[PDB]
Write an enzyme that holds these catalytic residues in place. Structure first.
Site, PDB file in Angstrom:
ATOM      1  CG  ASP A   1      -1.822   1.188   1.318  1.00 38.38           C
ATOM      2  OD1 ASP A   1      -2.809   1.273   0.552  1.00 38.38           O
ATOM      3  OD2 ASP A   1      -1.561   2.072   2.166  1.00 38.38           O
TER       4      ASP A   1
ATOM      5  CD  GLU B   1      -2.419   2.444  -3.533  1.00 43.88           C
ATOM      6  OE1 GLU B   1      -1.824   2.385  -2.429  1.00 43.88           O
ATOM      7  OE2 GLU B   1      -3.458   3.112  -3.695  1.00 43.88           O
TER       8      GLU B   1
ATOM      9  CG  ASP C   1      -8.164   3.348  -2.944  1.00 42.60           C
ATOM     10  OD1 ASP C   1      -8.870   3.480  -1.932  1.00 42.60           O
ATOM     11  OD2 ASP C   1      -6.999   2.895  -2.933  1.00 42.60           O
TER      12      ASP C   1
END
Ligand SMILES: [Ca+2]
Ligand SMILES: [Ca+2]
Ligand SMILES: [Ca+2]
Length: 494
Positions: A221, A250, A322
């Protein structure tokens, strides 16, 4: 003969509630909404429930489950404007060495990994070592003040950072400055300082713990918010304990003209982590969700295949937690099926965000967070999308051409995209027509002469292919593609 993968992305709290006794734990009580009407609270999905649904997931040909973070998250909510914000998503850690008690115990996690592995399914842990949780340095009573615990032992808080665990540099404001992105707080999230040997050892010890419980990979992340060189050392730590591991980060890109795209490429080429494929995602959503022509998709695809050193390890997706779900952007199931077929037959590793196969979406606030994380509603294994997702992964197991093959555009127009995947002698030719019925004049292909049936057996209105011997490249003449159709032709025996 490398293994091809297909990922299913699960937000644990929103997938399946198998155990009501952990919905509202005493240690972290008051953040559970049984009615599922406050979208910022825990809704009760857990590890036992996810384990019970492994057969449903296996039925889609999934080879790996990307699980949202299951580390222990803060036990008191972040109250903004009187609104209770629970860490239901897992990205607000308090303890990287413990399982979140809303989701289960170590025994529940071990059982989940056990059952996943018995089904041929890898476990990819979403890991968020950039930060702990929302903090106000001037108000220790807000949330848990960014507290970091080590298996229950408190290491410090943002307002009393005796060990200098955190950056105290304010919040990110210049989002194109790499130093600001790394050294300041993502919103009010207490930024960990990996240059501190205490923090560095802690995070590496934490990831060793999770690999001791036999996970198979990491989705990193907020990868743009940590020093690239530290992430590389983190990857080296993981590689030293498990050789066959799936690592991807990510690194959010804002669009084709994102000024940091070159750092994303450097990251993917040097750190040991691959990346989620945001460039391709933007083109996918543009052409299937916003009506753009396939030249955009094919152009983006060609660019990414030369920019990344290993495009075969890019992790592709249509939506995620997201951004609005595809059906919130364009409530067209034919377009959705076409985008699914595309990523399944495109290089790299495709991701299905949970419930895509059930056409799950909530369009409140345009479908944006939190409404892109609705509770999984049905487990219908007969939907057209479920059938599509289960069939193409079988072709991925029969040939490396889909994950690892070259990509050659054979026909690109506004609404017709015919592209060819090749690995050795294996060839898969795909024709997508997202417009109305039309006839293509001439297509070249490396398939041998003959008649090829649609691998999908007409599931998406596919048609046969009549390949003639061209001397050189072979030729298809006057191919009529039905409207909103996908046809898949291959010389690989099925
Ligand atoms: Ca539960
Ligand atoms: Ca907790
Ligand atoms: Ca940082």
């Amino acid at each position: 003969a490398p293994k091809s993968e297909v990922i299913y992305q699960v937000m644990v709290d929103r997938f399946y509630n198998g155990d009501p006794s952990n919905d509202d734990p005493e240690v972290s009580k008051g953040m559970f909404d049984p009615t599922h009407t406050n979208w910022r609270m825990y809704w009760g999905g857990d590890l036992k429930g996810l384990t019970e649904k492994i057969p449903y997931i296996k039925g889609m040909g999934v080879t790996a489950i990307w699980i949202s973070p299951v580390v222990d998250n803060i036990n008191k909510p972040a109250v903004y404007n009187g609104e209770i914000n629970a860490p239901y998503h897992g990205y607000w850690a308090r303890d990287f060495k413990r399982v979140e008690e809303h989701f289960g115990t170590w025994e529940d996690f071990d059982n989940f990994v056990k059952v996943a592995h018995e089904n041929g399914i890898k476990v990819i842990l979403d890991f968020a070592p950039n930060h702990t949780s929302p903090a106000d340095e001037e108000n220790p009573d807000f949330a848990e003040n960014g507290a970091l615990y080590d298996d229950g032992k408190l290491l410090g808080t943002y307002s009393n950072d005796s060990l200098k665990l955190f950056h105290h540099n304010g919040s990110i404001s210049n989002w194109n400055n790499l130093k600001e992105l790394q050294d300041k707080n993502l919103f009010d999230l207490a930024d960990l300082d990996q240059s501190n040997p205490i923090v560095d050892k802690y995070l590496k010890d934490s990831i060793k713990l999770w690999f001791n419980h036999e996970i198979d990979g990491v989705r990193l992340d907020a990868a743009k918010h940590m020093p690239m060189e530290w992430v590389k050392s983190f990857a080296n730590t993981i590689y030293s304990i498990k050789k066959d591991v799936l690592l991807f980060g990510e690194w959010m890109l804002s669009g084709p003209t994102d000024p940091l795209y070159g750092y994303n490429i450097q990251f993917a080429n040097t750190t040991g982590f691959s990346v989620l494929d945001f460039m391709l995602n933007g083109a996918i959503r543009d052409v299937f969700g916003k009506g753009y022509g396939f030249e955009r998709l094919n152009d983006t695809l060609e660019d990414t295949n030369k920019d990344y050193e290993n495009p075969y390890k890019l992790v592709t997706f249509i939506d995620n937690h997201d951004m609005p779900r595809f059906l919130s952007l364009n409530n067209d199931k034919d377009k959705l099926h076409e985008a699914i077929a595309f990523i399944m037959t495109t290089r790299g590793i495709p991701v299905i965000y949970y419930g895509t196969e059930q056409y799950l979406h909530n369009d409140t606030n345009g479908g944006n967070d939190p409404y892109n994380r609705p509770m999984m509603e049905k487990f219908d294994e007969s939907t057209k999308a479920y059938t599509l997702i289960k069939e193409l992964s079988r072709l991925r197991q029969l040939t490396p051409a889909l994950q690892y093959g070259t990509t050659t555009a054979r026909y690109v127009s506004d609404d017709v995209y015919i592209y060819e995947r090749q690995y050795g002698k294996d060839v898969v030719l795909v024709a997508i027509n997202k417009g109305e019925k039309t006839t293509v004049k001439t297509v070249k292909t490396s398939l041998r002469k003959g008649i090829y049936k649609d691998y999908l057996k007409g599931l998406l209105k596919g048609v046969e292919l009549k390949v003639t011997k061209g001397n050189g490249e072979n030729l298809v003449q006057d191919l009529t593609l039905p409207g909103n159709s996908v046809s898949v032709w291959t010389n690989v025996r099925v």
